[PDB]
PDB file of C-alpha atoms in Angstrom:
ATOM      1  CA  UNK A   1      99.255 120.088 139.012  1.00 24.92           C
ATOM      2  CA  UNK A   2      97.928 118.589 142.204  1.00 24.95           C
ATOM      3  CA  UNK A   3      96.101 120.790 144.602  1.00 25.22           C
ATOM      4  CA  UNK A   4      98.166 119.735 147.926  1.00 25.35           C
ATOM      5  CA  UNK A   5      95.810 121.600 150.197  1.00 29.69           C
ATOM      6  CA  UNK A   6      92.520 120.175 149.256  1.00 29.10           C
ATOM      7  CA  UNK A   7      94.491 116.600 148.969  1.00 30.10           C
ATOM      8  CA  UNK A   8      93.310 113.957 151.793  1.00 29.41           C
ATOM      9  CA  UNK A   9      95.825 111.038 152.363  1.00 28.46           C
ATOM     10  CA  UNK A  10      94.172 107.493 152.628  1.00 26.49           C
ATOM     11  CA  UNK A  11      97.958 105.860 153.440  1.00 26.83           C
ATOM     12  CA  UNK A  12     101.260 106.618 154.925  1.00 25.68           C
ATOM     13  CA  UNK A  13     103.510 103.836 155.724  1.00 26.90           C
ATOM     14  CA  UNK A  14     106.147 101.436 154.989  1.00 25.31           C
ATOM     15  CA  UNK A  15     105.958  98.485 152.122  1.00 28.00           C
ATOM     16  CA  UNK A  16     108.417  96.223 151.439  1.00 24.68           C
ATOM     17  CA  UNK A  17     109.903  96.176 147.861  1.00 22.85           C
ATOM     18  CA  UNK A  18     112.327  94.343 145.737  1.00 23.97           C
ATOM     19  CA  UNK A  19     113.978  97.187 143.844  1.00 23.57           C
ATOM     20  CA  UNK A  20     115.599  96.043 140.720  1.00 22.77           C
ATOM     21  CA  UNK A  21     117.706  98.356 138.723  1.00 23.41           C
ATOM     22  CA  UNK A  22     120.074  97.925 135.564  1.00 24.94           C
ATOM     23  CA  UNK A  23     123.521  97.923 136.965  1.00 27.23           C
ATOM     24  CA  UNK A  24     123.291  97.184 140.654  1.00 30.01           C
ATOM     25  CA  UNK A  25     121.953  94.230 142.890  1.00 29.10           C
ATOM     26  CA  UNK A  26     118.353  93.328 143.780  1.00 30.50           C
ATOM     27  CA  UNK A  27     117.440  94.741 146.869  1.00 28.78           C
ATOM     28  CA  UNK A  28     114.939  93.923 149.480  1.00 27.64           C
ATOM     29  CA  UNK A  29     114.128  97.260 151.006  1.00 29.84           C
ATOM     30  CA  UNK A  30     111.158  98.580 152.895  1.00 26.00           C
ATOM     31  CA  UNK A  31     109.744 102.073 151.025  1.00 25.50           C
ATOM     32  CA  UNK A  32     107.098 104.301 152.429  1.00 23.33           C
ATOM     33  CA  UNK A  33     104.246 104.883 150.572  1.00 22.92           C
ATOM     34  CA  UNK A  34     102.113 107.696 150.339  1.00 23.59           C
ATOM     35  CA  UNK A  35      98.737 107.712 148.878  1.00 24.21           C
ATOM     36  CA  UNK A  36      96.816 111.020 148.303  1.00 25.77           C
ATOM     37  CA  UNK A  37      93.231 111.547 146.722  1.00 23.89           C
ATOM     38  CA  UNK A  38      92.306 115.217 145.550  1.00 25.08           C
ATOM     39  CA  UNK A  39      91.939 117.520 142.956  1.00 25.97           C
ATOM     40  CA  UNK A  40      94.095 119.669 140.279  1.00 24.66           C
ATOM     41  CA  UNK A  41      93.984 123.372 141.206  1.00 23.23           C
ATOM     42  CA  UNK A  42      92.832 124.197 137.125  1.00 22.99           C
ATOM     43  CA  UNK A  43      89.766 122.009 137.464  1.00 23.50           C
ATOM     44  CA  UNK A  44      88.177 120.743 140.965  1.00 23.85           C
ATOM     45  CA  UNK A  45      86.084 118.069 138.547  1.00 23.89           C
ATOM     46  CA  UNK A  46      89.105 116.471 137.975  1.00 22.67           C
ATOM     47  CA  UNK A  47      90.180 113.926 140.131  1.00 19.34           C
ATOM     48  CA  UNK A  48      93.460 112.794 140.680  1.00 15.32           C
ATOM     49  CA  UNK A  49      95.078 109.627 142.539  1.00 13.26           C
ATOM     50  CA  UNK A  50      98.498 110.534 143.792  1.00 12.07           C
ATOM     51  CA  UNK A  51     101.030 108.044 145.121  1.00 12.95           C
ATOM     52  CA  UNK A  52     104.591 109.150 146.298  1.00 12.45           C
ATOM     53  CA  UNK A  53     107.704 106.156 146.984  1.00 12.42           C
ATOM     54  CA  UNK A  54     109.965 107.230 149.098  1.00 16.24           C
ATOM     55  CA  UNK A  55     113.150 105.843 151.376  1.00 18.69           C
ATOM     56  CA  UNK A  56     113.415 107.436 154.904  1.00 17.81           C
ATOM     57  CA  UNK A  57     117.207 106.522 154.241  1.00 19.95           C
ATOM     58  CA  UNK A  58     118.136 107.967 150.978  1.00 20.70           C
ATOM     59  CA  UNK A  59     116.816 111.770 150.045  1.00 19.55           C
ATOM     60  CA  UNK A  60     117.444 110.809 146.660  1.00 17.46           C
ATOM     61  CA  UNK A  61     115.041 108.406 146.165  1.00 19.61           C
ATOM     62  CA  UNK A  62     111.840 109.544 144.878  1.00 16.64           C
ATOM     63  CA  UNK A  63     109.554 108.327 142.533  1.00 19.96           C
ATOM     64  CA  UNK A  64     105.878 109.814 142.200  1.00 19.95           C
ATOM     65  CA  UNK A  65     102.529 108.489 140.129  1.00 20.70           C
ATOM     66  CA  UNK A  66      99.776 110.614 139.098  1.00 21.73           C
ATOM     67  CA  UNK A  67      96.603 109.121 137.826  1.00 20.15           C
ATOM     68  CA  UNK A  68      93.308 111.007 136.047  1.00 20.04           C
ATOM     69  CA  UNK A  69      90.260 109.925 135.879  1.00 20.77           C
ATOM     70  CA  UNK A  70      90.402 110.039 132.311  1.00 19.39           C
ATOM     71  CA  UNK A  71      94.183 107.704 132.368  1.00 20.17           C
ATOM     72  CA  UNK A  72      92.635 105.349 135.056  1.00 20.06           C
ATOM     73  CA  UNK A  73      90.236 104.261 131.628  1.00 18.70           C
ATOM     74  CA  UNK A  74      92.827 103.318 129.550  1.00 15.46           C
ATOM     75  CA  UNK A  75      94.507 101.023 132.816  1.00 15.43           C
ATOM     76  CA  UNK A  76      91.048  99.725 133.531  1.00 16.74           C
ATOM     77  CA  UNK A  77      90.835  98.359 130.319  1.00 14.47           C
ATOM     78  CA  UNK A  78      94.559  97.421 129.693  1.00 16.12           C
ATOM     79  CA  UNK A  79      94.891  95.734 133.223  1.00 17.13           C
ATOM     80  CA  UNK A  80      91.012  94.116 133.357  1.00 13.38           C
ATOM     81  CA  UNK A  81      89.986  96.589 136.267  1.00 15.00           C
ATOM     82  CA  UNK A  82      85.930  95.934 137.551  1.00 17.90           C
ATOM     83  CA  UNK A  83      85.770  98.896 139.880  1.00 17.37           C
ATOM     84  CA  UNK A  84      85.769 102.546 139.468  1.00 18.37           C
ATOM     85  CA  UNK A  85      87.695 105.469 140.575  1.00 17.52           C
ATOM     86  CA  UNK A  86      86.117 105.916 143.288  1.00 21.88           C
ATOM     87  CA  UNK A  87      87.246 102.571 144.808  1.00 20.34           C
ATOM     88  CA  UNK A  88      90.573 101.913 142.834  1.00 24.13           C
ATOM     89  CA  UNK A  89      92.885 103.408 145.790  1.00 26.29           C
ATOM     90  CA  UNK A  90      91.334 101.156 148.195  1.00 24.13           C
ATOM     91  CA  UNK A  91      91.776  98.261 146.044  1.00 27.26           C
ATOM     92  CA  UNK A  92      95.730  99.858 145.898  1.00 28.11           C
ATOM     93  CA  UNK A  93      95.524  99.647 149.473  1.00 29.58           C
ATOM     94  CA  UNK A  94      94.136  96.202 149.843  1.00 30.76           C
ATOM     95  CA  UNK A  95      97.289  94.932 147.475  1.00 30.10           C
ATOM     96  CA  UNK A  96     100.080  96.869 149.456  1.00 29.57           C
ATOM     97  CA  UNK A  97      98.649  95.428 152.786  1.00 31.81           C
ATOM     98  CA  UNK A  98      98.974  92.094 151.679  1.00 33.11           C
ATOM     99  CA  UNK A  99     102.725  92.365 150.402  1.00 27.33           C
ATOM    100  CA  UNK A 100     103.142  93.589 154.128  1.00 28.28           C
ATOM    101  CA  UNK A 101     101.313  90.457 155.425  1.00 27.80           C
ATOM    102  CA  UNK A 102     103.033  88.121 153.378  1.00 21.73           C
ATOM    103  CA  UNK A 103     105.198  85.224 155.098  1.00 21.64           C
ATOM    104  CA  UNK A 104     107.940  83.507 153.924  1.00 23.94           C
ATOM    105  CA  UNK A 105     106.433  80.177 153.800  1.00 23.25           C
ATOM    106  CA  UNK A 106     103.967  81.739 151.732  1.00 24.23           C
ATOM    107  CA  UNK A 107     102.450  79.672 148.490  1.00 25.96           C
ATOM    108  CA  UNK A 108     101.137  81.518 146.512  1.00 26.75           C
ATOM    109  CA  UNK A 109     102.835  84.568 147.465  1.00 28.83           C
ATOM    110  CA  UNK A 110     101.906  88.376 146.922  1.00 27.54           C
ATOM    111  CA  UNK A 111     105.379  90.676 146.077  1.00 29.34           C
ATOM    112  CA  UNK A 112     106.215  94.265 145.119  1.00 30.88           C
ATOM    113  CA  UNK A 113     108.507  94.830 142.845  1.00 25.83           C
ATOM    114  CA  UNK A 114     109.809  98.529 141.419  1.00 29.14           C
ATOM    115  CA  UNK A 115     111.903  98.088 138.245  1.00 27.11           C
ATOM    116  CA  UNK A 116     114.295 101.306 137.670  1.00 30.45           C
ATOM    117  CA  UNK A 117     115.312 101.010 133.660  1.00 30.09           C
ATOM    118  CA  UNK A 118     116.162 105.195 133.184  1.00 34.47           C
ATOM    119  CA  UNK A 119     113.989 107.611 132.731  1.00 33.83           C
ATOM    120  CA  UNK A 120     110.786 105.236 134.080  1.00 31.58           C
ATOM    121  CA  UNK A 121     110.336 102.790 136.898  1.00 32.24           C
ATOM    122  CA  UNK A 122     107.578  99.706 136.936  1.00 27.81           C
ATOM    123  CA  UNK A 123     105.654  98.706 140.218  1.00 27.68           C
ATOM    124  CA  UNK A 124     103.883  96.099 139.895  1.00 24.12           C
ATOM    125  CA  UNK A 125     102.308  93.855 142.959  1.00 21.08           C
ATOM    126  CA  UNK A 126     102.135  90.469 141.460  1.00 21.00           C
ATOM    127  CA  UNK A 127     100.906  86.894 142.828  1.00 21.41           C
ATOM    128  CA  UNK A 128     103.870  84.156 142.936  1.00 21.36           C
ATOM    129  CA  UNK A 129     102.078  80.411 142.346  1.00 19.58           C
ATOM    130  CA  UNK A 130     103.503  77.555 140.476  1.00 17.36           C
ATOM    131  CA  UNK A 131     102.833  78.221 137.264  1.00 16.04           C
ATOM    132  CA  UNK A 132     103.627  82.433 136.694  1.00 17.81           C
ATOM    133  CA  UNK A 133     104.067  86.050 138.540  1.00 19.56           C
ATOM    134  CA  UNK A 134     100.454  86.561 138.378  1.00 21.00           C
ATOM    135  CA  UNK A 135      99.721  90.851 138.010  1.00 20.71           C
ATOM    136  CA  UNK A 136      97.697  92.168 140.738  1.00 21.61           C
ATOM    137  CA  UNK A 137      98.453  95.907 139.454  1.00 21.17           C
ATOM    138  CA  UNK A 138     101.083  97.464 137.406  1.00 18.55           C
ATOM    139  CA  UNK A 139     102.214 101.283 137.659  1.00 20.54           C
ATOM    140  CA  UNK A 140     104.551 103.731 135.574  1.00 21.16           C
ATOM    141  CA  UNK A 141     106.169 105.654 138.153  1.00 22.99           C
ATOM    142  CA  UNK A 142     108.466 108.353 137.032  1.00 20.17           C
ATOM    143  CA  UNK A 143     111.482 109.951 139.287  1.00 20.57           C
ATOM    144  CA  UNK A 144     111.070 113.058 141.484  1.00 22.89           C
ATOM    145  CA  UNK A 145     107.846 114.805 143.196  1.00 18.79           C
TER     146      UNK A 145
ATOM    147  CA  UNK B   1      86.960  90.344 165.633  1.00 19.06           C
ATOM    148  CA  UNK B   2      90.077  92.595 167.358  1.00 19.15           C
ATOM    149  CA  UNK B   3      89.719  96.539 167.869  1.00 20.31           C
ATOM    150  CA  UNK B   4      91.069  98.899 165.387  1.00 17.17           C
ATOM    151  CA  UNK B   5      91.478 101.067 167.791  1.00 17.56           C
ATOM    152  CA  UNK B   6      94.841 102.689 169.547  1.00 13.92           C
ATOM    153  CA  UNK B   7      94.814 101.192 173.206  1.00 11.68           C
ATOM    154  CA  UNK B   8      96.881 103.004 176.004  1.00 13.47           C
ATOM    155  CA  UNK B   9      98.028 106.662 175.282  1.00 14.00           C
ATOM    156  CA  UNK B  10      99.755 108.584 177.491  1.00 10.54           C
ATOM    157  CA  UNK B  11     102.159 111.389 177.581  1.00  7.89           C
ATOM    158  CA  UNK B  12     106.021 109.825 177.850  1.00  6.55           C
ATOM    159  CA  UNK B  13     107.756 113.018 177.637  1.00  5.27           C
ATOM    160  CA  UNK B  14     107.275 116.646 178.341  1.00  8.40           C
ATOM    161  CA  UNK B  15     108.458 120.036 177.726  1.00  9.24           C
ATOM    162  CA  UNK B  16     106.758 123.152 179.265  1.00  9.86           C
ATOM    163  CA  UNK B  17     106.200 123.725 175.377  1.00  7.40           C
ATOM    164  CA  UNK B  18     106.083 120.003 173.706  1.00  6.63           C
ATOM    165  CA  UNK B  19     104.322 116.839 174.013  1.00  6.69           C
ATOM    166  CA  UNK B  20     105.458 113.507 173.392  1.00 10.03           C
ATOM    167  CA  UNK B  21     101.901 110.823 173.132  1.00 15.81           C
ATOM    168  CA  UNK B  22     102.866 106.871 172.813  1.00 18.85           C
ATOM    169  CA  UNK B  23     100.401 104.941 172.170  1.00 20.48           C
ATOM    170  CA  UNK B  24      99.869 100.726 172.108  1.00 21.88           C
ATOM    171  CA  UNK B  25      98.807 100.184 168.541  1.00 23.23           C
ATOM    172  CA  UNK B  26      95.787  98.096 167.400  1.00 26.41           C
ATOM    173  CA  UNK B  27      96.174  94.712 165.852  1.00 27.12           C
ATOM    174  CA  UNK B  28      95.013  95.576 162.201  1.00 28.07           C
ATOM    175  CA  UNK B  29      97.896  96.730 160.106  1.00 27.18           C
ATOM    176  CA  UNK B  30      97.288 100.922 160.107  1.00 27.71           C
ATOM    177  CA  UNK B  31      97.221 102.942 156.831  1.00 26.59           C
ATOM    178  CA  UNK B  32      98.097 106.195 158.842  1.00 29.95           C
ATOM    179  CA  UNK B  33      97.366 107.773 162.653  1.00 31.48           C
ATOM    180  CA  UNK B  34      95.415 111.309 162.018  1.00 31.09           C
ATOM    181  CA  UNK B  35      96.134 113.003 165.971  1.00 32.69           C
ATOM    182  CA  UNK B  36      94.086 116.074 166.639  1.00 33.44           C
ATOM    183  CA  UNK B  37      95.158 118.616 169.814  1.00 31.30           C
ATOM    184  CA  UNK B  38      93.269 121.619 171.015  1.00 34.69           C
ATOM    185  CA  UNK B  39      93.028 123.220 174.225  1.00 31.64           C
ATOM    186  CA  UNK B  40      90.460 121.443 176.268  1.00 31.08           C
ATOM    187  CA  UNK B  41      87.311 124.102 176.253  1.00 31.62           C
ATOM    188  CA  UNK B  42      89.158 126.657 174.414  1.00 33.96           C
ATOM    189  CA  UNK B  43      87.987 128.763 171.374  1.00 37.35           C
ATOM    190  CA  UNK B  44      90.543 128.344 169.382  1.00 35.81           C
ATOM    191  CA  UNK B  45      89.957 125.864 166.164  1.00 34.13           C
ATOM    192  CA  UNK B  46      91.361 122.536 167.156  1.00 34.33           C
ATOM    193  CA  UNK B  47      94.920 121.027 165.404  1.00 31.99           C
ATOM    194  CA  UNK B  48      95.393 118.442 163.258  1.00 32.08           C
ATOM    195  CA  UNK B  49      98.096 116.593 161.803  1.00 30.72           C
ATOM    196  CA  UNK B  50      98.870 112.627 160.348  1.00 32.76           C
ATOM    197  CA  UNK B  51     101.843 110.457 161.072  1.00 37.65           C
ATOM    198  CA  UNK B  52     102.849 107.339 159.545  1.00 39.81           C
ATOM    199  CA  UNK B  53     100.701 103.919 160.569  1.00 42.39           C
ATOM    200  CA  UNK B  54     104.614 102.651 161.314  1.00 44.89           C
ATOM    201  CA  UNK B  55     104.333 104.977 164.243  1.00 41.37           C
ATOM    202  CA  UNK B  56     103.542 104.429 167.868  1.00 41.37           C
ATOM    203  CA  UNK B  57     104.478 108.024 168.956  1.00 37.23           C
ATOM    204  CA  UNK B  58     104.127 111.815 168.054  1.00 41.02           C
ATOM    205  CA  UNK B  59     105.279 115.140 168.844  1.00 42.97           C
ATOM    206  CA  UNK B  60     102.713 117.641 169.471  1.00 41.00           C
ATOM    207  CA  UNK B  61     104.594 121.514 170.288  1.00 42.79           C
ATOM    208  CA  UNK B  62     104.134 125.268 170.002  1.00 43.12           C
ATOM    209  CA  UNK B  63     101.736 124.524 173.112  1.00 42.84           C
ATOM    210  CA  UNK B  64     101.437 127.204 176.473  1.00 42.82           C
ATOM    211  CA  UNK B  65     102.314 126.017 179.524  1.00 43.65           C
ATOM    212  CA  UNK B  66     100.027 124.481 182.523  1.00 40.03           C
ATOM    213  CA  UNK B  67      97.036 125.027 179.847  1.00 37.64           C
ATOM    214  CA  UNK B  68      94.566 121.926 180.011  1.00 37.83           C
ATOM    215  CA  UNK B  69      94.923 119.861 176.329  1.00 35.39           C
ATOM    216  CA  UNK B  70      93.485 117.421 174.578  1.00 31.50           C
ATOM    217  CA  UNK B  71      94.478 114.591 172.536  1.00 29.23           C
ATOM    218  CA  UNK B  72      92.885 112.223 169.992  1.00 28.51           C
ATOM    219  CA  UNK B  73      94.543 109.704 167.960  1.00 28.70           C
ATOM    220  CA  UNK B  74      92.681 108.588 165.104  1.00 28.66           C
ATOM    221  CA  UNK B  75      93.405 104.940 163.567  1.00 29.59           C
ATOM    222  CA  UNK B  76      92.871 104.336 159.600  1.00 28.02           C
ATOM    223  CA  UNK B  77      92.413 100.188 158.759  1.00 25.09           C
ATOM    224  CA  UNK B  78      91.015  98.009 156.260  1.00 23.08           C
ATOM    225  CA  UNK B  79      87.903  98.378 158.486  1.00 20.12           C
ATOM    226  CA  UNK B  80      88.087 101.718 160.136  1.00 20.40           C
ATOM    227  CA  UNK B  81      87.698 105.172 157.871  1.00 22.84           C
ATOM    228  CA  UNK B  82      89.702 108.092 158.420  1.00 21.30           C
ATOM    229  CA  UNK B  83      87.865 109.791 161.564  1.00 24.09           C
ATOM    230  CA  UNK B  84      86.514 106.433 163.241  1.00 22.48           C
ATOM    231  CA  UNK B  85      88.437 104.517 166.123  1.00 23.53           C
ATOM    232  CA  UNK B  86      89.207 107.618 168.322  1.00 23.96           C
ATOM    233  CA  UNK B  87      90.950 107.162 171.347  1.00 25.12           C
ATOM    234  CA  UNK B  88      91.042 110.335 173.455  1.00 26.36           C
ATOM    235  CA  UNK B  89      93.292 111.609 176.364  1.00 26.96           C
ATOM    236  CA  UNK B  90      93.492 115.018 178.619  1.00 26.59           C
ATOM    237  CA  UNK B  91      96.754 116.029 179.668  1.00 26.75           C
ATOM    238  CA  UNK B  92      98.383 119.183 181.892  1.00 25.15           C
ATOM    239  CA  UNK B  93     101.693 120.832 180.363  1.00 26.65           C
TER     240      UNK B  93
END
């Protein structure tokens, strides 16, 4: 439970995607993020990132992360993470602002990508080069609010 | 470097109730526009809300009529924090 009053929102826009799912063509399709830093009503010590992907054009299409500070340890270690808490969203934000920088002559060149397999979806911001799809960051997003 | 902040704003639009601000949007790429309205010299606690960084324009309404306002639109960038980068107008509904 995320306390929605006492939550502050560090971004609200538009990010362009490549939205993969099972049965139905890759699509390149611009989703607005929403970022939100606050607390859980059942415990203002606990602080929780909040990041909401949504599609001004389908009401349907909602997909929602919530991260502890307590889960953010086990991605710092599993993903190689040097900052804290306290600056991960910004790094978030540094990421997502360069997929929306990114040109097509671009080499290497910084994607989003959601991957929607059932019950989970994937995001994952990753660095294109000649060699591999380098991981920036990699999320478990899970459908609804 | 280039400003972060919003550059020409202006009310497009009006309704004796309803405000419609456009502003000319800074060069850095915008996290999200925090606009704040209160009557200009009033005692009432001033109003707040965010719109998208996608956005050049907002709706401000539920104002009075030929009551003195003012405007702020607040920028969010790489290198400007939530409340820095104000630009500020004063309209007449």
């Amino acid at each position: 439970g995320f306390d929605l009053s006492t939550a502050t929102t560090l971004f609200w826009r538009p990010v362009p995607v490549h939205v993969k799912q099972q049965d139905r063509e890759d699509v390149l399709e611009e989703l607005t993020f929403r970022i939100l830093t606050g607390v859980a009503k059942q415990n203002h010590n606990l602080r929780i990132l909040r990041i909401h992907i949504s599609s001004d054009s389908d009401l349907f299409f909602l997909h929602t992360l919530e991260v502890s500070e307590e889960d953010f340890q086990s991605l710092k270690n599993d993903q190689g993470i040097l900052v804290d808490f306290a600056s991960f969203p910004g790094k978030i934000i540094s990421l997502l602002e360069k997929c929306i920088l990114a040109q097509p002559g671009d080499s290497p060149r910084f994607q989003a990508v959601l991957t929607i397999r059932g019950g989970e979806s994937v995001f994952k911001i990753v660095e294109i080069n000649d060699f591999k799809q380098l991981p920036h960051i990699t999320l478990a997003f899970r459908p609804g609010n | 470097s280039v400003s972060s902040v919003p550059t020409k704003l202006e009310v497009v639009a009006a309704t004796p109730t309803s405000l419609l601000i456009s502003w000319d949007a800074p060069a850095v790429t915008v996290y999200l526009y925090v606009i704040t309205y209160g009557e200009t010299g009033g005692n009432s606690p001033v109003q707040e809300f965010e719109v998208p960084g996608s956005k050049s324009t907002a709706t401000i309404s539920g104002l009075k009529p030929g009551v003195d306002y003012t405007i702020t639109v607040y920028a969010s960038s790489k290198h400007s924090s939530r409340y820095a980068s104000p630009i500020s107008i004063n309209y007449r509904t």
